[PDB]
């Protein structure tokens, strides 16, 4: 039931960390093996997503979805600068334009692909959970006729009560499916960790 | 009066609930001591023929 402005406000705490650490990382870049920053960022991204996975609940306040982004601030802060420094390492000054164009093209393609996969997974797993849930709502079940009795107490018809129960099942399925995606993303991160070590150190 | 006797006798003979179909029991929401009306589901019988 959030609004657009409130929903956007829940992602403010991501920028608290980078807006500070970005210069410090830039200032001290002379004495860091940037690969170790990339590895730390991947571990920090896995931590944040597992954090979201085991803590999302129907009655979670604004703070329950604001601490994880505060943590993700570190992960985002130490991922762009080092990896982009590695990406454009050793190339002559004249070609920096073409390399940047290629990098941006690949990154945008990746973003589009990620959105396309995630949305479909979310909806389909919501459907699966809906199927597995609506089974329990049948006759021959206490604490199922009681719900109908309480609903009819408020004046709702039988059909309206059925619709209300269906809506609740849908919401629960969305939360479960949404948390199943976060778990998968963190797991996938755990494997992408070590690839950054294949890059030679000509950085400069 | 014979008609009323017949109605009462049918009422008494119906205190034993008989299965109308051959099949298998699936759900059981009836326990000893439950208060039952003609609108309360009790069991289900699922044949395996057709």
Structure description:
Chain B: This is Multidrug export protein EmrA. Chain B: It is found in: Cell inner membrane. Chain B: Part of the tripartite efflux system EmrAB-TolC, which confers resistance to antibiotics such as CCCP, FCCP, 2,4-dinitrophenol and nalidixic acid. EmrA is a drug-binding protein that provides a physical link between EmrB and TolC. Chain A is 69% helix and 0% strand. Chain A is mainly alpha-helical and 204 residues long. In chain A, α5 (96-134) crosses α7. The relative contact order of chain A is 0.13. Chain B has 50 residues and is an alpha+beta fold. In chain B, 24% of the residues lie in helices and 18% in strands. Chain B is built from one helix and two strands; from the N terminus they run αββ. A two-stranded antiparallel ribbon of chain B has the order 1-2. Chain A binds chain B through residues 138-142, and chain B through 27-29, 41, 44.
Could you tell me the number of beta strands of chain B? Answer: 2
Which sheet architecture does the biggest sheet of chain A show? Answer: none
Net shape of chain A: elongated
Quaternary organisation of the protein chains: part of a larger assembly
Percent in helix of chain B:
10-25%
- SSE string of chain A, helices as H and strands as E: HHHHHHH
What percentage of the residues of chain A does DSSP assign to strands (E)?
under 5%
- How much of the sequence of chain B is in beta strands? 15-25%
Summed up, what is this model?
Chain A is an all-alpha fold and 204 residues long. Chain A contains 7 helices and no strands.
């Amino acid at each position: 039931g959030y609004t657009a402005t409130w929903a956007g406000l829940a992602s403010a705490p991501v920028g608290i960390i980078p807006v500070i650490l970005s210069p410090i990382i830039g200032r001290f870049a002379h004495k860091l093996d940037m690969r170790r920053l990339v590895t730390f960022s991947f571990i920090m991204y896995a931590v944040c997503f597992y954090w979201r996975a085991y803590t999302f609940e129907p009655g979670m306040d604004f703070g329950a979805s604001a601490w994880p982004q505060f943590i993700q601030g570190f992960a985002v802060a130490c991922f762009f600068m080092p990896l982009t420094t590695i990406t454009l390492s050793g190339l002559p000054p004249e070609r920096l334009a073409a390399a940047s164009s290629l990098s941006n093209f690949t990154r945008t393609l990746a973003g589009s692909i990620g959105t396309s996969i995630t949305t479909t997974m979310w909806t389909n797993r919501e459907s699966m959970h809906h199927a597995q849930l609506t089974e329990s709502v049948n006759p021959f079940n206490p604490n199922a006729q009681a719900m109908y009795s309480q609903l009819e107490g408020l004046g709702m018809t039988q059909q309206q009560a059925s619709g209300w129960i269906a809506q609740q099942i849908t919401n629960q399925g969305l939360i479960i499916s949404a948390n199943e995606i976060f778990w998968m993303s963190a797991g996938i991160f755990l494997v992408l960790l070590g690839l950054v070590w294949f890059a030679k150190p000509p950085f400069g | 009066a014979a008609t009323e006797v017949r109605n009462a006798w049918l009422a008494l003979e119906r205190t034993r609930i008989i299965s109308p179909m051959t099949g298998y029991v699936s759900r059981r929401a009836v326990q000893p001591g439950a208060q039952i009306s003609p609108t309360t589901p009790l069991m289900a019988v699922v044949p395996a023929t057709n």
